[PDB]
Design a protein around this ligand. Structure first.
Ligand SMILES: NC(=O)c1ccc[n+]([C@@H]2O[C@H](COP(=O)([O-])OP(=O)(O)OC[C@H]3O[C@@H](n4cnc5c(N)ncnc54)[C@H](OP(=O)(O)O)[C@@H]3O)[C@@H](O)[C@H]2O)c1
Ligand SMILES: CC/C=C\CC(=O)/C=C/C=C/CCCCCCCC(=O)O
Length: 327
């Protein structure tokens, strides 16, 4: 019965204050799970949303909850039925949102959602990938219908909040797909988003950025919508005839909009997106980082002993790239 350091919250609404440092049993791998000694964990906005109560009645399943799901680490123990990993292997993995366990010294992941991390890729650089990166990949690959080898159709992509976790992957992945990328962000990251490969960058505080209006007049074929303030009517004049707004933060309004735009057979569509994590895709993204085709941008690094600072930074929402917790 080894013990570990972890952070957990015990109730809704506590913010970073409600995040409490605790000493808890190291989890035991089931027959299909692996136990990782964590080398890096990355936060996602859904992590603090769950704690706030915004994902009720789905999450969290039970209190207390150890938050975060994107991890990179070293395998220390594998389950009786695990074939692809042994102790000592460096990996990157996605933890179940049901059980969490990223802000801890150790975590268990299923074999299905664990991928070998090549030595060319650091732990933090890899831990930033699972949620943010796979979401960008899914949005551009399914609804936007792009191909990242070069077969794909030419296209105009808008990426809102291009400076955040999903956004900053989306911009880079979109360029690998030979698309014209228009991006929105704050004034301080304009040069940053340009360096990711965006053809046009808008400051969303300016009138033109708020209208999402392309400085060269482009109509968008698909929007990877990573921000939150914007009603469909703002997107509509900027969409091509059959353009899709891919809302990666679907709420009740999005769902309803989706419904009536299906019902009324609208040519311009709003499409909710719910990430489906698959190892093939994680393996694919990790490989892109290895080959230097995609770079992970890290907002900040925090030790586990001060992880409430990383949490606060997530909550605040001004992250540029991915927030990382290290041991
Ligand atoms: N459905 C799913 O499966 C799924 C998966 C992943 C994420 N999400 C959701 O998608 C959202 C974004 O995720 P994320 O990790 O990429 O967020 P994030 O990294 O935490 O957001 C940070 C960036 O967004 C920028 N931003 C905020 N408001 C903006 C606006 N109105 N216009 C342009 N930029 C803006 C911020 O810029 P400034 O500091 O300059 O203001 C900041 O740099 C979250 O709501 C998240 O829950 C959903
Ligand atoms: C009677 C059966 C139906 C009740 C369903 C209980 C839902 C639990 C909600 C969890 C939460 O508190 O967020």
């Amino acid at each position: 019965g080894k013990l570990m350091h972890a952070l957990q919250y015990n109730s809704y609404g506590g913010g970073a204050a409600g995040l409490e440092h605790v000493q808890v049993p190291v989890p035991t791998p089931k027959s299909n799970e692996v136990c990782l000694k964590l080398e890096a964990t990355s936060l996602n906005p859904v992590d603090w949303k769950i704690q706030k109560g915004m994902i009720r009645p789905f999450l969290p399943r039970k209190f207390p909850c150890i938050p975060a799901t994107d991890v990179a680490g070293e395998v220390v123990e594998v389950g009786s039925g695990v074939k692809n990993f042994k102790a000592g292997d460096k990996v990157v993995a996605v933890l179940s949102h049901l059980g969490g366990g990223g802000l801890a010294e150790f975590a268990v992941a299923t074999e299905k959602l664990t991928v070998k991390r090549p030595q060319e890729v650091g732990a933090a650089e890899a831990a930033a990938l699972p949620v943010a990166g796979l979401t960008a990949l899914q949005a551009l690959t399914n609804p936007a219908g792009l191909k990242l080898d070069g077969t794909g159709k030419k296209a105009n992509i808008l990426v809102t909040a291009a400076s955040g976790g999903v956004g900053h992957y989306a911009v880079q992945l979109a360029k690998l797909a030979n698309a014209h990328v228009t991006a929105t962000c704050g004034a301080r990251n304009i040069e940053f988003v340009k360096s990711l490969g965006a053809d046009e960058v808008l400051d969303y505080k300016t009138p033109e950025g708020a209208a999402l209006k392309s400085p060269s007049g482009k109509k968008y074929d698909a929007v990877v919508h990573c921000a939150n303030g914007i009603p469909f009517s703002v997107f509509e004049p900027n969409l091509s005839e059959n353009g899709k707004v891919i809302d990666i933060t679907p709420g009740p309004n999005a769902m309803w909009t989706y419904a009536v735009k299906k019902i009324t057979m609208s040519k311009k569509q709003l499409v909710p997106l719910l990430l489906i994590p698959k190892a093939e895709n994680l393996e694919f993204m990790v490989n892109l980082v290895k080959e230097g085709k995609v770079k992970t941008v890290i907002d900040s690094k925090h030790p586990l002993s001060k992880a409430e600072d990383a949490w606060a930074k997530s909550i605040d929402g001004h992250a540029t790239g991915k927030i990382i917790v290290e041991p």
